[PDB]
Design a protein around this ligand. Sequence first.
Ligand SMILES: Cc1ccc(-c2cc(C(=O)O)c3nc(NCc4ccccc4)[nH]c3c2)c(Cl)c1
Ligand SMILES: [Zn+2]
Length: 347
Amino acid sequence: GASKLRAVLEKLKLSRDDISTAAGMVKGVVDHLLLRLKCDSAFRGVGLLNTGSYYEHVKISAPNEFDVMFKLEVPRIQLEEYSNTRAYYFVKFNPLSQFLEGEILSASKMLSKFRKIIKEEINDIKDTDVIMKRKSPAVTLLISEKISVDITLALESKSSWPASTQEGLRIQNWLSAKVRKQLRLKPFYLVPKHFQEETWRLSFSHIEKEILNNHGKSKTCCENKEEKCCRKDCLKLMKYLLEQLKERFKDKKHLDKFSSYHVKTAFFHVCTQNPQDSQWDRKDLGLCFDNCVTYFLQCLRTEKLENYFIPEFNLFSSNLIDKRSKEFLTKQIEYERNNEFPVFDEF
Ligand SMILES: Cc1ccc(-c2cc(C(=O)O)c3nc(NCc4ccccc4)[nH]c3c2)c(Cl)c1
Ligand SMILES: [Zn+2]
């Protein structure tokens, strides 16, 4: 029954208008940061990933936790795959020559000046209270007492996607081969890794908005009441389930390695698995949500969740997340699934 799930989604939809007040605080902070960085020798080509978006909201339950990405175009960029990990690379070749450790581009040396300039500007204006938190790659600010913003620096490359993505983004049977070709013409991004190296991880997070806003096999999906689907609602419930489970056990360390990214990745694998819009009918919200929960548990038990763009990078590998952590999450979700999800009728 979709009765409980809709009420959860209705409760979630209410706190959306709280974001409008908090986001405005975030814009003023990052508008001041972008102008201070743009007149630095290394960060002349800095800017937001999306010119007006200004954020991404990882916490679908807490409207006070934002995630912001700054971009920096690195032209004539040469990448070396680090030990066949398929996702971590060295950047070698200039405004960025001050961070060169010989041939390769140092991530922590670029993060040092980036964190330094922000640290100096955060205190400089301080017409509104912004507090810097140091702890790994993200420069985490806190506006007033509630709002927290994660600022991530990313390198932008407008060349072809690296070979490891050749069989990724398997959307041909769902969104068509024409759309996959158009998406792969868009740039790709590299973010600091933070074992240990001066390597960068391939990032394709900017592709999520492109697909979430155009998500059906039918081009008119969710444009009229006759073909309203529940794809977005299922993703929201999947993200909220993990956030509640991570909140419920915040005094332990078992669920610290799982994020909405894993929940996103498994969901889009389900979208590949179920390409027809009829498989996502709104009347079947409870059933479709179960398909997502089932697949994610199958991933947890099998210790396998492929990067959606890099099929050879296992997000659930033992190097990344240990077996006891994945078994702990498996038990909690299976318990919630058997019990009609008690984490949903509370907060
Ligand atoms: C079709 C498609 C399109 C895009 C994506 C996608 C790719 C990446 C990536 O890094 O490649 C990525 N990262 C993130 N971070 C979110 C986060 C930030 C802070 C804390 C916790 C989570 N969300 C992402 C989504 C996927 Cl899974 C499917
Ligand atoms: Zn739809």
